[PDB]
Every structure is written in C-alpha cells, then in structure tokens.
Amino acid sequence: ASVYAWNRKRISNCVADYSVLYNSASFSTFKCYGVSPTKLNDLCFTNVYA
C-alpha cells in the first residue's frame, strides 16, 4: 500500500536471517541507522516492525 495507511508487521518469536537479506544484491538502498549493516546475526532484538 501507498503511504497513507502504511502497513506494520510485528514479527516475533522467530529467527531472523538478515545475512540472506543484505547479501542478495536485490536491493538499491540498504542503509542501517543505529546498528551496522552487518553484525545483525549476533543480536537478539525484542520487537521488530516491518
């Protein structure tokens, strides 16, 4: 959906796999703020939102 009612997916009780996310080259802009692009497979987040 466009930016008027932007969807919000609350992911929980999972095992994230950002390693296959930032190593697919199917993205044009991958900028991480607060955290580094890598070093995300060694962290355990409380609540993530897509």
Residue with tokens 């991480």: 32
The answer to whether residue 34 forms part of the interface with another protein (CB under 8 A) is yes
Q: Which is nearer to another protein, 16 or 39 (CB)?
A: 39
Q: Which is nearer to another protein, 4 or 49 (CB)?
A: 49
- Distances in Å between the Cα of 20 and the Cα atoms of 2, 9, 27 are 26, 19, 12
Cα-based torsion angle of the residue sequence 48, 29, 22, 37 in order, rounded to the nearest 10 degrees = -70
Q: Which is nearer to another protein, 11 or 32 (CB)?
A: 32
Binding site for another protein (CB under 8 A): 34-39, 42-43
